[PDB]
Design a binder for this molecule. Structure first.
Ligand SMILES: CN(C)Cc1ccc(S(=O)(=O)n2ccc(/C=C/C(=O)NO)c2)cc1
Ligand SMILES: [K+]
Ligand SMILES: [K+]
Ligand SMILES: [Zn+2]
Length: 358
């Protein structure tokens, strides 16, 4: 009798790269995930939540009006202008439909958050593109135009109270620089990220992503960065990180709503991440988060670029939200030595702020 929501809309496939049809952020990323849900017959077990466009008023919850106006103008640009405008950012391609698709993925998530916080569904999954977590207040970055998960947290605050406590768990393989920045001075939104770092060398190449960035002002303590260095990470490393850091801090935060920036480019077989998290692994992480916030969980697709890997992985995540038993997880071998060093580094950076860490 608890209902799981699912939002997907084909029109988000229209955002595309007109000079390199093989660019890895592919229209069929969302259609492959959705099709895999039909094959496992999870689709008919969920309630369909419709997509909509975000308003420009809603976009102003996190983004400047200058940044909204430039992306918006690209809907009518000639190809040569689309290319020149795209090159003014760090890793961005743009077509005439890009604007609408970025509006569609945020509006799909506002509707999903609204269904949760009125008690129409218990939890929800959002099969959307282009992704959001690199987008800054003032600019686009790394295939992202608007920060969908940040906009979703402010929209949720706007339909409840302003200080509603939102936990954002970001398990995409890259650091969510735009999201950290948007809430760095905020104690109402808890940002927890796992990400490949390599002493600042992995994308997005900034030392903002190290464990010593714990937040500013009244937000000191509410930013948790868990960086990996020098190892091909997998299910052991992520199970230990939840067990020691994510779940203690998050229980102590006691969120009223949980957003997952759910990128699957740390999954075994991705051509960018170099990690080996399994679909079983992602399922267990989902299952653990389900214990927070009276189960109010929203799963947001971010990165992830092996088509088979992202389909199997998110589908396991939907199977957890629907209530199925967690799958057989293999053996938690000891952690790569460097992954232990990483976890201890976060415990020492955050134990002054969280009484459940030492
Ligand atoms: C090594 N120096 C030159 C910097 C550098 C520049 C570009 C690229 S890139 O073009 O390969 N690139 C862009 C975005 C993503 C990931 C997106 C995602 O999944 N977020 O979740 C991957 C990598 C590195
Ligand atoms: K991340
Ligand atoms: K924060
Ligand atoms: Zn990524």
């Amino acid at each position: 009798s608890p209902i799981t929501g699912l939002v997907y809309d084909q029109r988000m496939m229209l955002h595309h790269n007109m000079w390199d049809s093989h660019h890895p952020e592919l229209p069929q990323r969302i259609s492959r995930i959705f099709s895999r849900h039909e094959e496992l017959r999870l689709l008919s077990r969920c309630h369909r939540i419709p997509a909509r466009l975000a308003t420009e008023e809603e976009l102003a919850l996190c983004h400047s009006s200058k940044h909204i106006s430039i992306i918006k103008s690209s809907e009518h640009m000639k190809p040569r202008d689309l290319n020149r405008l795209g090159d003014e950012y760090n890793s961005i391609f743009i077509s005439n439909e890009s604007y609408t698709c970025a509006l569609l993925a945020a509006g799909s998530c506002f509707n999903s958050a609204q269904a949760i916080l009125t008690g129409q569904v218990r939890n929800a999954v959002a099969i959307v593109r282009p992704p959001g977590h690199h987008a800054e207040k003032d600019t686009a970055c790394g295939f992202c135009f608007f920060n969908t998960a940040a906009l979703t947290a402010r929209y949720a605050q706007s339909i409840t109270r302003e200080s509603l406590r939102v936990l954002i768990v970001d398990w995409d393989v890259h650091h969510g620089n735009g999201t950290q920045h948007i809430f760095e001075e905020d104690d109402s939104v808890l940002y927890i990220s796992l990400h490949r770092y390599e002493d600042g060398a992995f994308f997005p190449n900034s030392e903002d992503a190290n464990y010593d960035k714990v937040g500013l002002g009244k937000g000191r303590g509410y930013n948790v960065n868990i960086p990996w260095n020098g190892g091909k990470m997998g299910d052991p490393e992520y199970m230990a990180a939840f067990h020691h850091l994510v779940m203690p801090i998050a229980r102590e935060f006691a969120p009223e709503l949980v957003l997952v920036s759910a990128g699957f480019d740390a999954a075994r077989g991705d051509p960018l991440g170099g990690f080996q998290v399994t679909p079983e692994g992602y399922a267990h992480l989902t299952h653990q988060l389900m214990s927070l916030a009276a189960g109010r969980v929203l799963i947001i697709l971010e990165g992830g670029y092996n088509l088979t890997s992202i389909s199997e992985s998110m589908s396991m995540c939907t199977s957890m939200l629907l209530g199925d038993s967690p799958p057989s997880l293999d053996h938690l071998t000891p952690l790569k030595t460097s992954a232990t060093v990483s976890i201890n580094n976060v415990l020492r950076a955050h134990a002054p702020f969280w009484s459940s860490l030492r």
